[PDB]
Write a protein that binds this ligand. Structure first.
Ligand SMILES: [Mg+2]
Lengths: 304, 88, 101, 128, 557, 198, 49, 132
RNA sequence: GGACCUGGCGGUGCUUCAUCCCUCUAGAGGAGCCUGUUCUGUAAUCGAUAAACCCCGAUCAACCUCACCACCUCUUGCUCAGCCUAUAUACCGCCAUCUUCAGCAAACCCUGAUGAAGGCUACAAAGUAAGCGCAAGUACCCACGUAAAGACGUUAGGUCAAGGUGUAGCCCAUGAGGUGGCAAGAAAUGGGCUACAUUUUCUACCCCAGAAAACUACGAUAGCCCUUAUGAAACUUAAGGGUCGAAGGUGGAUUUAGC
């Protein structure tokens, strides 16, 4: 209940003061981050679930935001859309519809739509898939319409940033170069590409033609420079370790491409990315499962 | 305590093993368990025997349960008299 | 008060092996070599054969220490697979967790 | 073996066969059946065959203002105590067995006319 | 030593003592089972070896009748086995040394042949005892042989026999040890009832005998001297000072026991300002800033007596000095057993409450209770009196809660004192509400008393105070309900209670309430009831029925 | 009917915000909810629920809490223990000077584990290390010593490493390492006739 | 040492300081069976002859 | 169907604590181990002895506090110390609790040759994490 | 007997699906051997045994293990006895199977006149707040994937031989101990290994080589012999060497696995 929440808030304030005393810091400037660090130090827990570790947050966060009963002592609900059972969702829809009406009166890249779980957390109300789809359609109709700054801010409450994903150094002799790293399977490589050179690659201190006898590995090495037409114009010193011949070739290729990105133009960097020369390959060996011959092959189902 | 100290984390070791699931037959069904061993190496440099003993006692008496410790001590020594000059 | 008579037999075998281990080691060292004369080695063979049968370490079986199960025993914990699973799945064994990777 | 023993709950679950296909189906007639009993109904901590009196556990810690010492009941009084425990268990079982009849409905094997008491009370001061 | 859990934290001194005794009983039971079944605990898996966790044996190994077997039984303190071994040795004629028989005499005389007490299996000197029998059977006797018997006789209060054996030793021209001298001092003092000067001369003569024998005395000598001279009090006061001066001159530094004995000697009903004040002040000046050490078995009772006189003299500064001396170094370990510690802290807190500012008094209350001890109802009453003197009644509710923590919930004296202090005066509505809540809690405690085996006893003053507090808080309905308790248990309602009830009724204009008050007062036949009746006609708008009832009740005047 | 004991309110209520925490927890002790004045919650919450409160929370009881090692407590403990420390020689500023003055390094290991038995065989191993450059040898003695030691000498690091593990105690292994170094040095400085067959 | 463990627990149960629930269940079943008529005969007295 | 250490839902009324509620695959994920000792770490030894000791301690404590235990024990080991942390219902008078604490501590200390401490936390009733 | 409801079924209609079929790769089905089962034999275990038995309980049998057999021995016995004696069709415990599922079960509410029964439409028309499962979260290298998880229920599914236990039975024996012993192929079948080679074989090397290449080829981890390792015990097990160079020449219907 509300009185319970008030008591929890008072207890949290007292506990915050006590924790500040315990860690020897100013209670007046003991932020939530300090509280979390102190709790993690005093009550260490290796449990992988972060929600299972000890927590002493504010009651506004520990307790669900569904709040106590939505009516006072008289029993009158606070919200006028309470009897809809989804007062948050329908209030939001009503506000969006009012915004659309006002837009009628007056007259993509780094963001995505929050998932249904995120919206449910926002409104602390359970919602159906079709309800979420209807709200998304309304929001997208709002966006497509000539939305103003206020509507853009309203949408940004639901926009979620998309997860889309170089230095130049000088040696002791003033040779401008770039250094980068790459991984492929188990092989790990570190490459150094100099700004000016005459196409000489030394792998582990050994020339590539003597270190990579297979023509395929040399072709993989040639791929980045040949893509940007810079064959024979750069000097590369790279060291690779682990894996086999092809894994090492791929790791060196990725490291060389990433390092060479420091010299080619931004459009050339984008072209290299679109060619796949910069994406770290996540294809790694899959573990063998018990009761099976291999990663995916089952044992021969016995003849019947 | 005025002791130079450095910290690093050696790579963990995850020992895994497999057991038959059912008490009888059903060989194709197993349960796999593991025992993760996480490490932390503290290197303390250039401290005397008394300070080393005090610090080791302090950190060992407070060692949390479930955490083992392996302290390696590099004892500086002088050449014995027999080795400073040849007896021959 | 052991789990079964087989566990009792194993305990007796272990005790006798511990009792006779020094003499068995000495006689085997007398045997497993080529330095000593052949007649002495044959006498040592006869003597070690004359020793009680249960003193031989090969007769010791690593049964489970709680259910006397003679197979599926993890040597590090000396428990059968069933008992080890029962204890590990209840969290009563330190640091042992289900392996998922 | 001590390590092979189990708890009372597990033993009751195993012996009573409360679960399983037999309970669900009942193909195997169980007129000769077992019922759960509380083995710890009347057991007092610190009471056993040897009849020892441990101060502070089963006998008063301080008697006549002085701390009692470890004392063992005589064989006669210990036998009397064991017999009294047996008789108390028998009395508890007898009281468990006794019950009270009810009033039949329209006929001795028909539910019609049998009263069910008042309806369950409502959530907020709404009783019947 | 207790468990830091709300359900297992002791809530009284009695509960504290009982919990500690129960824990010790559990430890004793465990030790008994360990000793009874050693084969279940012989598997030693500890590295390094831990001897104190191994089972202990109580069976002699040397079974053949020999001197080694006798010494083994003496070390094992098996009195019956030792006596049987000596008898068999004497009958068989096998060799025994003077030292072995001396050790046997030590074992027998120290216990006085009384069998030692284990977990399970006045002149206490028995007239029929084997110690004197073996001493007679002893062919060779030395200084130690006489000394052990004398010490055993004195320990068992066989003073006459000890003096006779000392006379025998003197005739044999042996030199008694200092312990024998102390035992003889005790025997000489306790043997006969004489004036102080006779015992004083006897003690000086024994000391001169020791000087002639060249034996140098110890702390135990003067300690026993003072302990035995404690009877004469005023007679031995100055001679005790002479003994202390002699101790200082010799260099035998007095310990806590010596000062405690001097304190007990100088303690007597009368005027402590005469000499006792000088004694305690000089002792405190001497001992200030000195760390003590275990020197005498009676060193633990010093602080108890010191705080007793501190309370008696009403010198809070002296008590503070004593407490500081206790806190310095490891002197706190000399506070003594649980009873002595409780008495010491009780007297200290009583003195603090009596003679200190209420702020420092509350600081001391927080510091000591419950960490130091659990207060008694009298100490709580003293604290309440100090608070009332300071007029800091706002703490009074908290104290009651503290009382509920310390088991004084059902203490009638404390409850009545709290109620009288709260209801004595009228206070702002916040304090009045706090007092009403405290009174309601006290009433609830009265309803839940464990003395609920017969018709409950309700103190009249307590009921009046609770009703007055409730009325002054505006909770008149509870007072109206409680008015029936007076009639039920014949407890006279207070005159001020009736006055306040009538005032509230007149302000609220409730003639029925005034009629009820007059009915109660007439049931109790108080004279004030007459005025109440008049007041009901004088201050209230009275209906015809109520007026007729008042006229009829007027005949009771 | 016998009275039923009522549990007291926890003493965290009587605590003060500016008290001395190390007094409450001087030593390592299990998490006591009645003694920790913090509203800590642990446990995976149920749906539309909150993490379990500390009272009865077995999860918090499982955690090896560091409430007895707060920074204030650590600072006070170090201040107390400063009396026990001895200053390291300020002259030996770097490992170069350490090798210059102390050319023999002895490595040993102490293993700490939970259990009633403290014995551990791996603690008996002693590793002596010395730079041949720091020794006093000529060309012939160095060459003979290298052949004598075999794999124990790494020419890259110029460090001779003698590992003693055959004696039951660490002190015995250290004595054996010193003796082995002594005899190796003396034989290195000793020249045999058959050495002419090189 | 199963001897040590079992004997110690049995002795504690006899002393009343250890409530062996499993042994209590076994004793209850034994009493019921003895009432039913199932009892061990004396040695050397096998029913089959 | 997996059956290990799981409490199967029957009617939605049976109460279970936090540990009983969670299935074995939640160990080290949502619930820690009930015994902490260095036996199972890399290179360490005497794991079997510690496991046997833990099993015996759990059985002994369950049989010594009949019905008092409100949850599983926590067996912590620091050096040669041995802390048994238990959660107990407030059934018995504290005299019996203190007697049992002293008894169990002394007996276990003499039986395992290590200083055994017993820390009890009392609860009014078995803590209910959820109903099944 | 009339009408209706639910289910089953229809050589029942329509619609849409999946690895159901074709398509892709490598296998099995032919040979030898390893191993498992079955059968025979023997004085000589048991259990699993359609998918969901068949390198299964076993992460393992020369003695031990061992529960089998023959012979001999013991009787308060290691146990306040014991039993691997019967019953998985009394059970706990741990699992298989659909599940490579998404639903389940309570507590209510409503409709049908308060009949059995039924309860969905998103521009929504009576369903629903909670619980369990999926999901989410977590482990591994990510947000992907793989693990893990996977309710209720189905097959009286498997296990009384992990252990515990109900009932029943044994107690000079269905208990306990000792010595010795099986374990062979006339076979059938399941899985696996090695092959039948030239994208191969041998050597060097770890991918720029030289030879071999059909009766002195390819092809045995088989047989025979001799060492060696372990062990008290080895023609038994394993490793190595020698010797032998066998069947076989890419294998039918059918069948397994993979994204
Ligand atoms: Mg009838």
């Amino acid at each position: 209940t509300e009185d319970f929440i008030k008591k929890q808030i008072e207890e949290f304030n007292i506990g915050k003061r006590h924790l500040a005393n315990m860690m020897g810091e100013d209670p007046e400037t003991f932020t939530q981050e300090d509280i979390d660090r102190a709790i993690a130090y005093l009550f260490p827990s290796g449990l992988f679930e972060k929600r299972a570790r000890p927590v002493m947050k504010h009651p506004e966060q520990i307790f669900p935001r569904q709040r106590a009963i939505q009516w006072g002592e008289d029993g009158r609900p606070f919200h006028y859309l309470f009897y809809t059972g989804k007062q948050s969702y329908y209030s939001l829809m009503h506000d969006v519809y009012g915004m659309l009406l006002n837009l009628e009166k007056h007259q993509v890249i780094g963001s995505r739509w929050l998932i249904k779980e995120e919206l449910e957390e926002m409104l602390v109300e359970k919602l159906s898939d079709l309800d979420y789809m209807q709200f998304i359609r309304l929001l997208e109709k709002l966006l497509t319409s000539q939305c103003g700054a206020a509507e853009e801010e309203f949408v940004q409450r639901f926009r979620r940033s998309v997860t889309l994903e170089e230095p130049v150094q000088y040696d002791e002799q003033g040779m401008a170069f770039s250094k980068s790293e790459g991984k492929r399977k188990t092989a790990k490589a570190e490459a150094i590409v100099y700004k000016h050179g005459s196409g000489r690659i030394k792998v582990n201190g050994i020339d590539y033609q003597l270190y990579f006898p297979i023509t395929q590995d040399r072709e993989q090495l040639m791929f980045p420079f040949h893509f940007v037409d810079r064959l024979g114009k750069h000097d590369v010193t790279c060291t690779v370790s682990g894996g086999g011949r092809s894994a090492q070739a791929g790791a060196i290729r990725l490291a060389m491409a990433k390092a060479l990105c420091s010299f080619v133009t931004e459009d050339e960097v984008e072209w290299m990315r679109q060619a796949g020369l910069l994406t770290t390959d996540p294809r790694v060996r899959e573990r063998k499962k018990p009761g099976q011959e291999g990663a995916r092959r089952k044992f021969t189902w016995k003849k019947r | 305590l005025g002791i130079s100290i450095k910290v690093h984390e050696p790579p963990r070791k995850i020992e895994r093993f497999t057991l038959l699931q059912s008490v009888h037959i059903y060989k194709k069904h197993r349960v796999q368990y593991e025992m993760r061993t996480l490490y932390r190496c503290l290197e303390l440099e250039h401290l005397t025997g008394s300070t080393a003993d005090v610090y080791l006692e302090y950190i060992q008496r407070n060692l949390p349960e479930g955490v083992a410790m392996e302290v390696t001590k590099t004892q500086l020594e002088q050449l014995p008299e027999h080795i400073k000059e040849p007896i021959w | 008060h052991y789990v079964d008579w087989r566990m009792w037999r194993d305990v007796k075998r272990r005790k006798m092996a511990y009792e006779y281990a020094d003499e068995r080691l000495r006689i085997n060292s007398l045997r497993k070599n080529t330095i000593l004369p052949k007649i002495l080695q044959d006498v040592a063979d006869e003597e070690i054969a004359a020793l009680p049968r249960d003193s031989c370490p090969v007769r010791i079986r690593n049964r489970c220490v709680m259910t006397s199960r003679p197979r599926g025993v993890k040597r590090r914990w000396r428990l059968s697979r069933i008992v080890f699973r029962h204890l590990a799945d209840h969290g009563q064994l330190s640091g042992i967790q289900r392996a998922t990777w | 073996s001590f390590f092979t023993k189990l708890t009372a709950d597990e033993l009751w679950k195993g012996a009573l066969a409360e679960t399983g296909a037999g309970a669900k189906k009942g193909r195997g007639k169980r007129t000769k059946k077992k019922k759960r009993k509380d083995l710890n109904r009347g057991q007092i901590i610190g009471e056993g065959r040897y009849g020892f009196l441990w101060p502070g556990l089963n006998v008063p810690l301080m008697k006549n203002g002085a701390v009692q010492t470890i004392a063992q009941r005589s064989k006669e009084e210990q036998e009397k105590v064991e017999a009294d425990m047996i008789q108390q268990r028998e009395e508890w079982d007898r009281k468990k067995k006794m019950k009270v009849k009810r009033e039949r409905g329209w006929s001795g094997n028909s539910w019609g006319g049998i009263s069910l008491g008042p309806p369950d009370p409502g959530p907020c001061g709404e009783t019947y | 030593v207790f468990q830091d859990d709300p359900y297992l934290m002791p809530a009284s001194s009695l509960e504290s003592r009982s919990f500690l005794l129960a824990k010790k009983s559990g430890e004793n039971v465990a030790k008994f089972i360990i000793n009874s079944y050693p084969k279940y605990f012989q598997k030693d898996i500890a590295e390094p070896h831990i001897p104190c966790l191994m089972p202990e044996y109580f069976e002699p190994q040397i079974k053949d009748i020999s001197e080694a077997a006798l010494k083994e039984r003496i070390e094992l303190r098996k009195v019956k086995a030792s006596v049987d071994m000596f008898d068999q040795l004497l009958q068989a004629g096998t060799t025994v040394s003077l030292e072995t028989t001396n050790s046997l005499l030590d074992l027998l005389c120290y216990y006085g042949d009384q069998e030692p007490s284990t977990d399970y299996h006045g002149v206490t000197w028995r007239a029929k005892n084997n110690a004197e029998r073996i001493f007679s059977l002893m062919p060779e006797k030395n200084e130690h042989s006489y000394c052990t018997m004398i010490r055993g006789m004195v320990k068992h209060r066989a003073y006459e026999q000890a003096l006779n054996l000392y006379t025998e030793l003197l005739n044999n021209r042996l030199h008694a040890d200092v312990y024998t001298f102390n035992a003889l001092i005790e025997a000489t003092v306790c043997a006969i009832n004489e004036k102080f000067e006779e015992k004083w001369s006897k003690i000086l003569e024994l000391l001169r005998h020791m000087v002639a024998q060249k034996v140098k005395p110890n702390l135990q000598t003067f300690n026993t001297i003072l302990k035995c001279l404690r009877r004469f009090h005023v007679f031995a006061r100055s001679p005790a000072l002479q003994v202390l001066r002699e101790m200082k001159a010799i260099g035998i530094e007095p310990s806590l026991a010596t000062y405690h004995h001097i304190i007990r000697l100088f303690d007597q009903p009368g005027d402590p300002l005469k000499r006792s004040s000088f004694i305690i002040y000089d002792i405190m000046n001497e001992l200030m800033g000195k760390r003590f050490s275990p020197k005498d078995p009676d060193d633990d009772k010093f602080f108890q007596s010191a705080m007793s006189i501190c309370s008696s003299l009403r010198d809070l500064e002296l008590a503070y000095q004593v407490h500081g001396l206790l806190k310095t170094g490891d002197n706190w370990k000399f506070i003594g057993p649980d009873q002595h510690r409780n008495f010491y802290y009780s007297k200290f807190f009583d003195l603090i409450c009596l003679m200190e500012q209420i702020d420092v008094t509350l600081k001391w209350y927080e510091d000591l209770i419950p960490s130091a001890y659990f207060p008694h109802s009298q100490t709580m009453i003293h604290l309440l009196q100090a608070l009332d003197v300071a007029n800091r009644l706002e703490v009074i509710p908290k104290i009651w809660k503290d009382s509920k923590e310390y088991g004084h919930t059902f203490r009638s004296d404390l409850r009545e004192e709290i109620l009288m202090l709260m209801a004595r005066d009228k206070h702002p509505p916040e304090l009045q509400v706090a007092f009403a809540d405290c009174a309601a809690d006290i009433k609830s405690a009265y309803e839940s008393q464990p003395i609920r085996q017969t018709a409950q006893d309700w103190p009249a003053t307590s009921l009046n105070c609770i009703a007055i507090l409730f009325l002054r808080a505006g909770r008149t309905q509870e007072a109206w309900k409680m008015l029936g308790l007076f009639r039920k248990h014949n407890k006279i309602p207070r005159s001020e209670l009736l006055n306040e009830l009538m005032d509230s009724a007149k302000v609220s204009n409730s003639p029925s309430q005034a009629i009820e008050v007059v009915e109660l007062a007439s049931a109790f036949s108080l004279p004030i009831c007459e005025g109440l009746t008049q007041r009901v006609m004088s201050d209230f708008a009275i209906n015809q029925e109520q007026k007729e009832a008042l006229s009829n009740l007027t005949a009771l005047t | 009917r016998p009275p039923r004991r009522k549990a007291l309110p926890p003493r965290t209520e009587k605590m003060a915000v500016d008290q001395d925490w190390p007094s409450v927890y001087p030593v390592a002790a299990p998490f006591k909810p009645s003694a920790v004045p913090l509203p800590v919650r642990m446990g995976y919450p149920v749906k539309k629920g909150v993490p379990m409160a500390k009272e009865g929370n077995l999860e918090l009881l499982k955690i090896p809490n560091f409430l007895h090692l707060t920074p204030v407590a650590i600072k006070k403990h170090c201040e107390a223990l400063k009396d026990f420390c001895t200053e390291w020689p300020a002259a030996l500023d770097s490992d170069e000077k350490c090798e210059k003055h102390f050319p023999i390094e002895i490595d040993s290991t102490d293993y700490v584990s939970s259990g009633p038995s403290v014995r551990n065989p791996r603690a008996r191993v002693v590793v002596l290390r010395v730079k041949l450059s720091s020794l006093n040898l000529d060309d012939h003695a160095k060459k003979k010593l290298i052949k004598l030691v075999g794999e124990r000498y790494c020419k890259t690091t110029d460090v001779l490493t003698i590992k003693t593990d055959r004696c039951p105690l660490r002190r015995q292994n250290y004595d054996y390492a010193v003796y082995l170094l002594t005899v190796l040095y003396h034989e290195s400085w000793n020249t045999e006739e058959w050495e002419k067959s090189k | 040492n199963h001897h040590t463990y079992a004997e110690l627990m049995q002795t504690l149960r006899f002393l009343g300081l250890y409530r062996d629930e499993h042994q209590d269940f076994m004793d209850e079943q034994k009493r019921l069976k003895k009432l039913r008529g199932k009892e061990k005969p004396k040695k050397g007295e096998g029913k089959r002859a | 169907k997996n059956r290990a250490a799981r409490v199967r839902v029957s009617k939605g009324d049976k109460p279970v604590t936090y540990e009983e509620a969670h299935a074995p695959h939640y160990i080290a994920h949502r619930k820690g181990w009930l015994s902490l000792h260095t036996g199972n770490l890399d290179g360490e030894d005497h794991a079997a002895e510690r496991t046997v000791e833990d099993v015996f301690l759990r059985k002994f404590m369950w049989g010594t506090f009949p019905g008092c235990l409100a949850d599983q024990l926590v067996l912590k080991r620091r050096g040669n110390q041995l802390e048994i942390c238990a959660v107990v219902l407030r059934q018995l008078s504290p005299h019996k609790y203190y007697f049992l604490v002293g008894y169990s501590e002394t007996l276990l200390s003499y039986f395992y040759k290590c200083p055994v401490r017993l820390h009890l936390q009392t609860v009014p009733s078995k803590v209910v994490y959820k109903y099944l």
